[PDB]
Amino acid sequence: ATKDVATDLAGEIRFQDIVPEEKTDRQGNTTRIAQRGGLLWVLAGDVYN
């Protein structure tokens, strides 16, 4: 199964030990899959669009 995890703090993402690997779909869809399971920190802030 699958489950989406969505943040509740607005800010900058910072990897920690996460090693993304780019898997390119035949249409060019570069999906980032983590080879090394780590942490995705969110450093809080005010994000402006």
Coordinates of all heavy atoms in Angstrom, one line a residue:
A1 N 0.8 -1.2 0.0 CA 0.0 0.0 0.0 C 0.9 1.2 0.0 O 2.1 1.2 0.1 CB -1.0 0.0 1.2
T2 N 0.2 2.4 -0.2 CA 0.9 3.7 -0.2 C 0.1 4.7 0.7 O -1.0 4.5 1.0 CB 0.9 4.2 -1.6 OG1 -0.4 4.5 -2.1 CG2 1.6 3.3 -2.6
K3 N 0.9 5.7 1.1 CA 0.3 6.7 2.0 C 1.0 8.0 1.8 O 2.3 8.0 1.9 CB 0.3 6.3 3.4 CG 0.0 7.4 4.4 CD -1.4 8.0 4.2 CE -1.7 9.1 5.2 NZ -3.1 9.7 5.0
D4 N 0.3 9.1 1.6 CA 1.0 10.4 1.4 C 1.1 11.1 2.8 O 0.2 11.2 3.6 CB 0.2 11.3 0.5 CG 0.7 11.3 -0.9 OD1 2.0 11.1 -1.1 OD2 0.0 11.6 -1.9
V5 N 2.4 11.6 3.1 CA 2.7 12.3 4.3 C 2.9 13.8 3.8 O 3.7 14.1 3.0 CB 3.9 11.8 5.0 CG1 4.3 12.7 6.1 CG2 3.7 10.4 5.4
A6 N 2.1 14.7 4.5 CA 2.1 16.1 4.1 C 2.5 16.9 5.4 O 2.0 16.6 6.5 CB 0.8 16.5 3.6
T7 N 3.2 17.9 5.2 CA 3.7 18.7 6.3 C 2.6 19.6 6.9 O 1.6 19.9 6.3 CB 4.9 19.6 5.8 OG1 5.1 20.6 6.8 CG2 4.5 20.3 4.5
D8 N 2.9 20.0 8.1 CA 2.0 21.0 8.8 C 2.8 22.2 9.2 O 2.2 23.1 9.8 CB 1.4 20.3 10.1 CG 2.1 19.1 10.5 OD1 3.0 18.6 9.8 OD2 1.7 18.6 11.6
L9 N 4.1 22.2 8.9 CA 4.9 23.4 9.2 C 5.4 23.9 7.8 O 5.9 23.2 7.0 CB 6.1 23.1 10.1 CG 5.9 23.2 11.6 CD1 7.2 23.0 12.3 CD2 5.2 24.5 11.9
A10 N 5.3 25.2 7.6 CA 5.8 25.9 6.4 C 7.2 26.3 6.6 O 7.6 27.0 7.6 CB 4.9 27.1 6.1
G11 N 8.1 25.9 5.7 CA 9.5 26.2 5.8 C 10.3 25.4 4.8 O 9.8 24.9 3.8
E12 N 11.6 25.4 5.1 CA 12.6 24.8 4.1 C 12.8 23.4 4.5 O 13.1 23.0 5.6 CB 13.9 25.6 4.2 CG 15.0 25.0 3.4 CD 16.4 25.6 3.6 OE1 16.4 26.6 4.4 OE2 17.4 25.1 3.1
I13 N 12.8 22.5 3.4 CA 13.1 21.1 3.6 C 14.6 20.9 3.7 O 15.3 21.6 3.0 CB 12.4 20.3 2.5 CG1 10.9 20.2 2.7 CG2 13.0 18.9 2.3 CD1 10.2 19.4 1.8
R14 N 15.0 20.0 4.5 CA 16.4 19.6 4.7 C 16.5 18.1 4.8 O 16.0 17.6 5.8 CB 17.0 20.3 5.9 CG 18.4 20.0 6.2 CD 18.9 20.5 7.6 NE 20.3 20.2 7.8 CZ 21.3 20.9 7.5 NH1 21.1 22.1 6.9 NH2 22.5 20.5 7.8
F15 N 17.2 17.5 3.9 CA 17.4 16.1 4.0 C 18.3 15.8 5.2 O 19.1 16.6 5.6 CB 18.0 15.5 2.7 CG 16.9 15.3 1.7 CD1 17.3 15.3 0.3 CD2 15.6 15.0 2.0 CE1 16.3 15.1 -0.6 CE2 14.7 14.8 1.1 CZ 15.0 14.8 -0.3
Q16 N 18.2 14.5 5.7 CA 19.2 14.0 6.7 C 19.4 12.5 6.4 O 18.4 11.8 6.7 CB 18.8 14.3 8.1 CG 19.8 13.7 9.1 CD 19.3 14.0 10.6 OE1 18.4 14.8 10.8 NE2 20.0 13.4 11.5
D17 N 20.5 12.2 5.8 CA 20.9 10.8 5.4 C 20.0 10.3 4.3 O 20.2 9.1 3.9 CB 20.8 9.8 6.6 CG 21.4 10.4 7.8 OD1 22.5 11.0 7.7 OD2 20.8 10.3 8.9
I18 N 19.1 11.0 3.8 CA 18.2 10.5 2.7 C 19.0 10.6 1.4 O 19.6 11.6 1.0 CB 16.9 11.4 2.6 CG1 16.0 11.0 3.7 CG2 16.2 11.1 1.2 CD1 14.6 11.6 3.6
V19 N 19.0 9.4 0.7 CA 19.7 9.4 -0.6 C 18.7 9.1 -1.7 O 18.4 8.0 -2.0 CB 20.8 8.3 -0.5 CG1 21.6 8.2 -1.9 CG2 21.8 8.5 0.6
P20 N 18.3 10.2 -2.3 CA 17.3 10.0 -3.5 C 18.1 9.5 -4.7 O 19.2 9.8 -4.9 CB 16.9 11.5 -3.7 CG 17.9 12.3 -3.2 CD 18.5 11.6 -2.0
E21 N 17.3 8.6 -5.4 CA 17.8 8.0 -6.7 C 16.7 8.4 -7.7 O 15.5 8.2 -7.5 CB 18.0 6.5 -6.6 CG 18.1 5.9 -7.9 CD 17.9 4.4 -7.8 OE1 17.6 3.9 -6.7 OE2 18.1 3.7 -8.9
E22 N 17.2 8.9 -8.8 CA 16.3 9.3 -9.9 C 16.0 8.1 -10.8 O 16.9 7.6 -11.4 CB 17.0 10.4 -10.7 CG 17.2 11.8 -10.0 CD 17.6 12.9 -10.9 OE1 17.7 12.6 -12.1 OE2 17.8 14.0 -10.4
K23 N 14.7 7.8 -10.9 CA 14.3 6.7 -11.8 C 13.4 7.4 -12.8 O 12.3 8.0 -12.5 CB 13.5 5.6 -11.1 CG 14.3 5.0 -9.9 CD 13.6 3.7 -9.5 CE 14.4 3.1 -8.3 NZ 13.8 1.8 -7.9
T24 N 13.9 7.4 -14.1 CA 13.3 8.1 -15.2 C 12.2 7.2 -15.9 O 12.6 6.2 -16.4 CB 14.3 8.6 -16.2 OG1 15.1 7.4 -16.6 CG2 15.2 9.6 -15.5
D25 N 11.0 7.6 -15.8 CA 9.9 6.9 -16.5 C 10.1 7.1 -18.0 O 10.8 8.0 -18.5 CB 8.5 7.4 -16.1 CG 7.4 6.5 -16.4 OD1 7.7 5.4 -17.1 OD2 6.3 6.7 -16.1
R26 N 9.5 6.2 -18.8 CA 9.7 6.3 -20.3 C 9.3 7.6 -20.9 O 9.7 7.9 -22.0 CB 9.0 5.1 -20.9 CG 9.6 3.7 -20.5 CD 9.0 2.6 -21.4 NE 9.6 1.3 -21.1 CZ 9.4 0.2 -21.8 NH1 8.5 0.2 -22.8 NH2 10.0 -0.9 -21.5
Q27 N 8.4 8.3 -20.2 CA 8.0 9.6 -20.7 C 8.9 10.7 -20.1 O 8.7 11.9 -20.4 CB 6.5 10.0 -20.3 CG 5.5 9.0 -20.8 CD 4.1 9.2 -20.2 OE1 4.0 9.8 -19.2 NE2 3.1 8.7 -20.9
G28 N 9.9 10.4 -19.4 CA 10.8 11.4 -18.8 C 10.4 11.8 -17.4 O 11.0 12.8 -16.9
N29 N 9.5 11.1 -16.7 CA 9.1 11.4 -15.4 C 10.2 11.0 -14.4 O 10.3 9.8 -14.1 CB 7.7 10.8 -15.0 CG 6.6 11.3 -16.0 OD1 6.6 12.5 -16.3 ND2 5.8 10.4 -16.4
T30 N 11.0 11.9 -13.9 CA 12.0 11.7 -12.9 C 11.4 11.5 -11.5 O 11.1 12.5 -10.9 CB 13.1 12.8 -13.0 OG1 13.6 12.8 -14.3 CG2 14.2 12.5 -12.0
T31 N 11.3 10.3 -11.1 CA 10.7 10.0 -9.8 C 11.9 9.8 -8.8 O 12.7 9.0 -9.0 CB 9.8 8.8 -9.8 OG1 10.5 7.7 -10.3 CG2 8.6 9.1 -10.6
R32 N 11.9 10.6 -7.7 CA 13.0 10.5 -6.7 C 12.5 9.5 -5.7 O 11.6 9.7 -4.9 CB 13.3 11.8 -6.1 CG 13.6 12.9 -7.1 CD 14.2 14.1 -6.4 NE 14.4 15.2 -7.3 CZ 13.4 16.2 -7.5 NH1 12.3 16.2 -6.9 NH2 13.7 17.1 -8.4
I33 N 13.3 8.4 -5.6 CA 13.0 7.3 -4.7 C 14.2 7.2 -3.7 O 15.4 7.2 -4.2 CB 12.8 5.9 -5.4 CG1 11.5 6.0 -6.2 CG2 12.6 4.8 -4.4 CD1 11.2 4.7 -6.9
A34 N 14.0 7.2 -2.4 CA 15.1 7.2 -1.5 C 15.7 5.8 -1.4 O 15.0 4.9 -1.0 CB 14.6 7.7 -0.1
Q35 N 17.0 5.7 -1.6 CA 17.7 4.4 -1.4 C 18.0 4.2 0.0 O 18.0 3.1 0.5 CB 19.0 4.4 -2.2 CG 18.8 4.1 -3.7 CD 20.1 3.7 -4.4 OE1 21.0 3.3 -3.7 NE2 20.1 3.8 -5.7
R36 N 18.3 5.3 0.8 CA 18.7 5.2 2.2 C 17.6 5.9 3.0 O 17.3 7.1 2.8 CB 20.0 5.9 2.4 CG 20.4 6.0 3.9 CD 21.8 6.5 4.1 NE 22.2 6.6 5.5 CZ 23.4 6.9 5.9 NH1 24.4 7.1 5.1 NH2 23.6 6.9 7.2
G37 N 16.9 5.1 3.9 CA 15.9 5.6 4.7 C 16.4 6.5 5.8 O 17.1 6.1 6.6
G38 N 16.0 7.8 5.8 CA 16.5 8.8 6.7 C 15.4 9.7 7.2 O 14.3 9.3 7.5
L39 N 15.7 11.0 7.4 CA 14.8 12.0 7.9 C 14.7 13.1 6.9 O 15.6 13.4 6.2 CB 15.2 12.5 9.3 CG 15.3 11.6 10.5 CD1 15.5 12.3 11.8 CD2 14.1 10.7 10.6
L40 N 13.5 13.6 6.8 CA 13.2 14.8 6.1 C 12.8 15.9 7.1 O 11.7 15.9 7.6 CB 12.1 14.6 5.0 CG 11.9 15.7 4.0 CD1 11.4 15.0 2.7 CD2 10.9 16.7 4.5
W41 N 13.8 16.8 7.4 CA 13.4 17.8 8.4 C 12.7 18.9 7.6 O 13.0 19.2 6.5 CB 14.7 18.4 9.1 CG 15.2 17.5 10.2 CD1 15.7 16.3 10.0 CD2 15.1 17.7 11.6 NE1 16.0 15.7 11.2 CE2 15.6 16.6 12.2 CE3 14.6 18.8 12.3 CZ2 15.7 16.5 13.6 CZ3 14.7 18.7 13.7 CH2 15.2 17.6 14.3
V42 N 11.9 19.7 8.4 CA 11.3 20.9 7.9 C 11.8 22.0 8.9 O 11.5 21.9 10.1 CB 9.8 20.9 7.9 CG1 9.3 22.3 7.6 CG2 9.3 20.0 6.8
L43 N 12.6 22.9 8.4 CA 13.0 24.1 9.2 C 11.9 25.2 9.1 O 11.7 25.7 8.0 CB 14.4 24.5 8.8 CG 15.4 23.4 8.5 CD1 16.7 24.0 8.0 CD2 15.5 22.5 9.6
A44 N 11.3 25.5 10.2 CA 10.1 26.4 10.2 C 10.5 27.8 9.7 O 11.6 28.3 9.8 CB 9.5 26.5 11.5
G45 N 9.5 28.4 9.1 CA 9.6 29.8 8.6 C 8.3 30.3 8.0 O 7.3 29.7 8.3
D46 N 8.5 31.4 7.3 CA 7.3 31.9 6.6 C 7.7 31.8 5.1 O 8.6 32.5 4.6 CB 7.1 33.4 7.0 CG 5.8 34.0 6.3 OD1 5.1 33.2 5.7 OD2 5.6 35.2 6.5
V47 N 6.9 31.1 4.3 CA 7.2 30.8 2.9 C 6.3 31.7 2.1 O 5.0 31.7 2.2 CB 6.9 29.3 2.5 CG1 7.0 29.2 1.0 CG2 7.9 28.4 3.2
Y48 N 6.9 32.5 1.2 CA 6.2 33.5 0.4 C 6.2 32.9 -1.1 O 7.3 32.4 -1.5 CB 6.9 34.8 0.4 CG 6.6 35.6 1.6 CD1 7.6 35.9 2.5 CD2 5.4 36.1 1.8 CE1 7.4 36.7 3.7 CE2 5.1 36.9 2.9 CZ 6.1 37.2 3.9 OH 5.8 37.9 5.0
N49 N 5.1 33.0 -1.7 CA 5.0 32.6 -3.1 C 5.1 33.8 -4.1 O 4.5 34.8 -3.8 CB 3.6 31.9 -3.4 CG 3.2 31.0 -2.2 OD1 4.0 30.3 -1.7 ND2 1.9 31.1 -1.8

